[PDB]
Symmetry: none
Subunit: 280 residues, 7 copies
């Protein structure tokens, strides 16, 4: 018996190589594209906004004292932060596998862009963390909730609250799961609100485009006129550098790869952004 | 450690200046544009309307004396009122900030026109306050309210009460807060009345354009044929003047900025306007 | 102080006169248009109708006396009544105010034509008054009312009662308020029977044109085939002539304006008209 | 004093004559239009109609005896009955009123065809009366009624019972009032089953033409294949003859007008006609 | 046009000229195709066949009436004829649908048809809901259903189904409902017993073979006849029902 | 008696032969077409996929140590299995029935391909069996189930779970039995969400094509982006060879027919496939 | 060609082309108020089959036509029965004896003969505003009548010397066996009640029949269908010959 087992003639057949590497789910970036992309060259930004406009204009009787109106201002600061991470690899591995170099680069950019988007949306606003949209966003009005309101009614309300600043909304940010449980809403009769089982509804709600991102926490929603309520300032575009002489890399026969970026998030009109919690 | 800290070498870096002052939300003016416009150059206005038309036109018997009809007239007057306000600023701020005056000018106009619109609607009528639409408007008929009516029905009822003057309506004034809860109405099944979540309904109701304005008090509505019920008469347009010698301004090294305007609201047909209140 | 007050220099500024007199609401005249229009040069009208048709036609046995049928007739008369009214005015007022002349004319004509419509619909028939559509109209058959009928069903029933005399109905006449409450009917769900809030329903129901007129008493409705049931006969069109020699007039420098008209309403088929009362 | 009343010169005014006469509601003739029409020339008509078809057709074994099946029909006879009536009028009237006769003719023909339609539908069958559709008609199957059926369901049921004889139903005969109370049916939610308030529905039910004649008694209904099952035989068409020599007419200046007609109703397939009563 | 949707039309119509018909169908396909270990013995598959026969049966009936009525009344002559055809064709279905299969009776559909799945019945189903289930059971043979057979009585109450709202399911009173269900034609036959229903892919699962068309003949001189001055009318027909796919037909009971 | 049975002249008439054979129900092959059909020429396959991407990208303080990120890989193998079966028939049968040869071929193919599909879906994975989709697929997230969900709701949930891998779904796989009970879903009123007893609904759900095959187990269901999550590699196409000299087939006048095939199933992204159970 | 008058000849002969007929009779008359009735005359068939053998029929052409004539006569004798004593029920014709008015016994004179009774009946014919036509008797009865003598010996009817054919009181006599033994009938058949012939007496044959084909026998049949109508039931009188 001359089989193709290991302990036989099987050591003659070489398994076919599948050209290429299998990359996991490539998340579609959104948050960054929702804002204005301007670039700077300094470590901070200073914009000026009208604080308190005490308008006392009124009807004045003939030959009488007219009303006095006062205005207030403020200098708002927006610091630039830095995001980055490095990978220490074997100088040997890099030579034995050429395509690895180009791969690591494309993978470090995505890896960075993720925690970038994660900042733009949920920036703690503390020490180094950026002042993310959700930290700035004016809290949702708990009074807009009426008897028997669907989860969809809430977002509808949110959209209005944006108008309380005389500004049109741009889009809606929801966690994919929440968006899901919403499209599957039914009426007291049993029917489907968005679309019959015959076809999955498009990503639109109340005329406004919907943006489902895993970056958005579960049970948290954000609505506003992002297209011009805040803008991102690029001090330095994300780039990848490599050093052979870094530390003891020359001695351990290693290679250090770096991928960094410098961002600065400015929040012009916080009244045009709303964050809330899906009470359920 | 030569960092960018405040106590270190972080003094050479100057934050990038972002040009332009950030103006808040600009409330879209409407009430002014609704009413017919015309101007005068007098202190007041005098129009005459048919008061009491005693119509006794009846069937007359042959060889008999016919009926006598009478027509009464009245002289109605509409006084011109003045609206204004001033800002006492410092000369220091004025010279050190060039584009400031230019800003205040294009700011006081809005601040004034805001009260202008606020007057035309909720005009007190007492003293120097204008006799706004809500004061003149014939009160809503509580009798029209039937058991099981939504806020949408009430407005529909009002549109009819306007017809009792043989004049068709042309607009519906509502507080954005209320207009919202109306657009988001549901039936027993659960479906939306104005439009499914797929898209937001346009600002129209019963064939008549809806005008949502923050100038309209919450829980108050106004309907009528404004385009032919009342007319605004402008004596003097919004003007801005500055004075260096006003009072002790010369000594205190100050500068006063004034912004005034002269109006006159006439109400030809009060029966063509209605004011109401939602009881809920 | 030199103010615009009365007890001051306010005597030099004369209020601007607004050209034009403000007429009240002019009711859109109908009814007279629903009926056929003919002209006459006599003082009365005589037409003939089949009174009683005694049809005894039946099956006849061989060699037997047959049934004798009989027919009765009648001479129906429609007298010509005169409607008018006059107005006595001072020669001063008429000369000092030129436009007044032509104004009074356009007012008496309306005031006259108003009572004209008022007769055609609710004519007492008492001597001088015309026999209006309602005094003639065949009463609604209460037996048609089923359990749980809406005010809309009632009209539908009425329309049929006309067919019960082999005659097609022309239109429906109701008080504006009633027509309103009708158009705003809802089902056990909430949907609008005639039209969702999007737009107001057209003045049409059950294929027949609806005619809302303040001339129609509240709670009263009149359905029928007016186009081929009744006819209006004009002896003399509405004319307006003035004279200042009428009695005292010349010696008191007065002016008497007259506005007369001669009519005659004929009711050919009273069975084709229906009047009734809604259940409160 | 010179009026238009009797006392004065009112004698000079002669009322305007209205050319023409007013005929009452001319009922639209049907029923006989639903049946097959044929001409004859006999005093009666001996025919036959399949009563019982004993079908014994079955699978036959080879060299075996075939099944004997017979068709038993009864020999029914359709007698020729005569319908008519006459009018004894004054000769003075006939000469003074020219077109009077022409009227009476077209008037008696109507009265005749009217009581004719009354026979074809509800013919007693006793003596001189014909065997009307409702007499011959096979009773409705009460077992077809189910829990919670509407009047509309019943007719639908009947239509099926017509198929028991295997013959497509020609139409549905109902009393105008019943047909009415049917068109105005609503579902358990409110919506209109037929046309809605917007427009009246056509006289069609279950694809079959509906015939609403006052000839049909209230609460009674008839469904079947009229255009196939039964046939009308015209011995003598409806004609009108006049004679002033009849009896003692010549001696009293009288004119006797006769309107006669000879008929004969046959029923080929009685199983194809259903009659019933609406239980309320 | 009273096409009661002839039950025959639902089946393939072919002509023959012999005593009977013989077709071959695959009985048992023993499929053992499976994964095979290297250098090992493979699975042996097998196939079974059968020579299924469909006999040609004869259907007919006769009547005897006086000649003085036939040759004397011509339009009646053809009447009796056209009635015997209807009478025969009516019993024709009677076999095609409920054939005993024994003796001379044809092997009817219901006899062959695979039983209905009593488990498919869910809590709170309509009558039409069940028929829908049947349409699926037909798919257990990889064949699109072709038609639905029902008793006029049952079918009647079917088209009159209503929702908890009030409206009709098959059609608002404005117009009559056409004989169709889930896109499948429906045949109302008195031949189909009440409470019984038949569904399947008739279009290509069973075929009817006509040996002799329904013909009517008369005999002036048959036995007695000549003496009794009578006449014997005969309406015969020769059929043969073949059943290719039995799994493609369903029979059940409206448990309600 | 001269009949046509055995004991008579029935042997003279030969039964009519029906052309060819009647093949049973041929199941529709689907699964194989849902995947990528690749070609090979080896014994096995080696593809590399990124395992654990330890992304530690974060916001770094000035002049501070950066976050170290790491990446992990793996070499996944896909073995080539062999599927086949043979059938030895009598030499006689083959020569006496020419149509048989080509028939057996067509049957062995359908028989093989049938067990092929039976592997691709529910491949055990152990021994020589392939690693079928179901044994690879990620289990359905029970958490996604909300109170009051239909079977159709669950499938909708699965479609989302696919997106949780940043990949769009391709189709739905269900046992016709379960799929059936789904198309027959009704609302609280009783209407069919898909059909409505007029026409059978198409095999499409939520915009995605539905695939009902007996290959899928009862109660089990699979959803994912098949046309990209996996790939089938063919080493040897389905071929049928005939041997007459196989062992003692020469001496027994036999003939063996073989039908072999070589496959290899690869599972690139298991996260893009879901499997579950309908608890009910 | 039997030289004898037929009851068929007595009545008026006409043709028809219908299933039945709608004619009108005459009941009573109180001489006023006359009575009439719209009656029906059904066209019923009559005939009698005769079967022999083809071995004889094919071996004699002269005998062929012979039987045809022997049956035509055999038919008339049966046809005569349907006309006279016709039951008028199932497949029987509206008979004469059934429709005929009974004899008036109050017309018999004590001392007359058997023939005198016949003369009395001829008179009752006039009592209907009609003229008499003929007499129908039983051969045996009619025989005894022709052979009558008085108390002395002389012939009542008349000697063979100046004898002729079948007449009595100047009227045709039809001696039929269909007439019961001791019964008679008189009427104005010539213009009273007549017969309408739908189909004349035709003859057809068939080798295939009840047996025939297997027995080699052949069946012969003379089918004839007609209708008998009675216009004046008063113009006919049937009576019982009392003896």
């Amino acid at each position: 018996s001359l089989g193709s087992d290991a302990d036989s003639a099987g050591s003659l057949i070489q398994p076919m190589q599948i050209p290429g590497i299998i990359m996991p789910g490539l998340r579609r970036l959104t948050i960054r594209d929702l804002l204005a992309q301007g670039r700077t060259s300094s470590n901070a930004l200073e914009y000026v906004r009208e604080e308190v406009f005490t308008n006392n204009a009124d009807v004045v009787a003939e030959k009488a004292l007219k009303p006095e109106s006062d205005i207030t201002f403020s200098k708002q600061t927006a610091n630039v932060k830095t995001i980055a991470h490095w990978v220490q690899a074997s100088r040997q591995v890099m030579d034995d596998a050429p395509m690895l170099q180009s791969y690591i680069n494309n993978r470090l950019m995505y890896g960075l862009a993720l925690k970038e988007e994660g900042q733009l949306l949920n920036g703690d606003g503390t020490g180094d963390n950026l002042e993310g949209l959700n930290k700035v966003a004016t809290a949702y009005d708990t009074s807009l909730n009426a008897t028997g309101d669907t989860r969809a009614d809430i977002i509808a309300h949110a959209i209005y609250q944006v108008t309380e600043s005389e500004f049109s909304a741009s889009g809606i940010v929801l966690n994919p799961r929440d968006w899901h449980n919403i499209a599957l809403l039914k009426d007291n009769e049993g029917r489907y609100i968005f679309g019959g089982p015959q076809a999955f509804t498009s990503n639109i709600m109340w005329g406004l485009p919907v943006v489902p991102t895993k970056a958005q926490a579960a049970g948290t929603f954000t609505v506003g006129g992002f297209d011009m309520a805040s803008q991102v300032w690029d001090r330095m575009d994300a780039t990848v550098e490599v050093s052979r002489e870094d530390r003891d890399n020359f001695v351990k026969n290693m290679l250090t790869i770096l991928c960094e970026e410098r961002l600065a998030l400015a929040h012009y009109r916080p009244t045009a952004i709303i964050k809330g919690t899906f009470s359920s």
